Amino acid sequence: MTDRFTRLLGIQQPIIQAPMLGVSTPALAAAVSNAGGLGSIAITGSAAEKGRALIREVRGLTDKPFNVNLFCHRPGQADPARERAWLDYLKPLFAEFGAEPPVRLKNIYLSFLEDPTLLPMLLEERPAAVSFHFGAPPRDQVRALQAVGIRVLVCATTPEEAALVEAAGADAVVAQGIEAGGHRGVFEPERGDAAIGTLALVRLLAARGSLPVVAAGGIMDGRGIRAALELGASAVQMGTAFVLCPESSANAAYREALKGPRAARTALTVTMSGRSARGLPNRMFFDAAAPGVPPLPDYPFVYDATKALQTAALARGNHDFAAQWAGQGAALARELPAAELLRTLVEELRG
C-alpha cells in the first residue's frame, strides 16, 4: 500500500468518508477519523459562525484529523424573470399538496468565492483538511490555508480540471468519476460534461499527473479500494457506502430507498438543484428539455425551489421528491456503524 496520502494527512488508512451535505454529521466524521480514516463534514449553506460550531463539534468527538468541505462554484446569478417562470411551471406540483410555490428564490448556498467570512474562520479553526467542490480557490488562498498547516483537497472530473487544481496548489486531487453519487464536480457545466468513468479518470490523473489522487465514485468495498490503488490512486473517497451508517443524518425514507430495489438504478438530473447530480430517480427527475419546460434558473436558486416543494410534499407524507443521492454501486451498500464499516473495508482491502 502507498503511504503518499496517509503520510500527508497523518492518518492510518487511505479512506475518506465523503462530505455529504444533509447526510454527513459530526458523529459520522468523528467515527471514521477515530477508526483511522478521514471523516468529513460539509459546511456550505451555514453562516461562518455556525460552520465554526460544527468544526468544534467534531473536535469534541475526535482528536484525529478530519476534513471540512466547502462548495466553490461560480456565485449564482439571480434572474427574477427566469425564476418566476420556473416557479409557475412547478405550480401544479405544489398544488397537489395544497401548497403554493414560494414567491422568491434565494441563493441558499453561498460559494467560498462570495462569502469572505469563511477563509478567516478556517484559518482560526485549522481543521486537518479543507476540501473544495465545483472549483478551486485562488492559489494565494490555498497557500494561506497551508501556511497554518491545513491540507487542501479539490475535486476534479477531468484532466483539464486536474490541471487547474495543480495551478491552485492543492495537496491532493479528488478524482470524481461518473459513478459518483451526489453533485458532479464539473467546474463549468455550460461547457459540457466529459462524464469520465472512475477507472479511466483515476488512471489518467495518476499516470500523467503528479499530485496524489483520491478516487471517488462507485467504490463500495475493499475490492473497489484495491482496484483504485492498482490504478494509481493514493486513497479513496466513499460517500454512498457511508449513507446507511447509523451516525448519518439520512432519514428513514432515504435508508429504505437505498436498501431497496431502486438502488439498482441511479440517474443524473439538473432539475433537482440546477447542477447535475446523481441519485435514485423520482418525481424531481424530469426532462428539462421537454416542450413547455421553461429555461432553468441558476444553481443554487433551483434547489431553493425544490426544497420548498420537498417541504410541501413531506407535509403530506409524500417522499417522491426527496433528494436521495447515491452512486452507481448503490446496490452494494451495507448498513453498519461507521467505525466497523471502516474496519471491514480495511480487512477487505488487505484480504
Ligand X SMILES: Cc1cc2nc3c(=O)[nH]c(=O)nc-3n(C[C@H](O)[C@H](O)[C@H](O)COP(=O)(O)O)c2cc1C
Binding site for ligand X (CB under 6 A): 18-21, 23, 42, 69, 131, 133, 155, 176, 179-183, 216-219, 237-241, 243, 325-327, 329
Distance CA 157, CA 201 (A): 7
51 binds a second copy, rule: CB under 8 A: no
Nearer to ligand X, 24 or 62 (CB): 24
Task: Check whether 69 is labelled as a binding-site residue.
Answer: yes
Task: Check whether 237 is labelled as a binding-site residue.
Answer: yes
CA-based max dimension of the chain: 58
CA 69 to mean position of chain CA atoms:
8
Distance CA 344, CA 222 (A): 8
What's the closest the beta carbon of residue 212 comes to ligand X, in angstroms? 16
Task: Check whether 218 is labelled as a binding-site residue.
Answer: yes
Contact 174, 155 (CB under 8 A): yes
- The site partner of 35 among a second copy, ligand X, none (C-beta below 5 to 8 Å per kind) is none
168 binds a second copy, rule: CB under 8 A: no
Nearer to a second copy, 13 or 25 (CB): 13
Nearer to ligand X, 202 or 241 (CB): 241
**Residue 132 bridge partners (DSSP):** 70, 154
Name the DSSP class of 291: T
Task: Check whether 282 is labelled as a binding-site residue.
Answer: no
Task: Check whether 224 is labelled as a binding-site residue.
Answer: no
Distance CA 16, CA 238 (A): 6
**Residue 277 bridge partners (DSSP):** 183, 269
Distance CA 232, CA 227 (A): 9
Number of H helices, E strands in the chain: 12, 11
Binding site members for FMN: 21, 69, 176, 181, 218, 237-240
Residues in contact with a second copy by CB under 8 A are 158-160, 177-179, 194-201, 203-204, 207-208, 217-221, 223-224, 226-228, 230-232, 264-267, 289, 327-329, 331-332
Binding site members: 21, 69, 176, 181, 218, 237-240
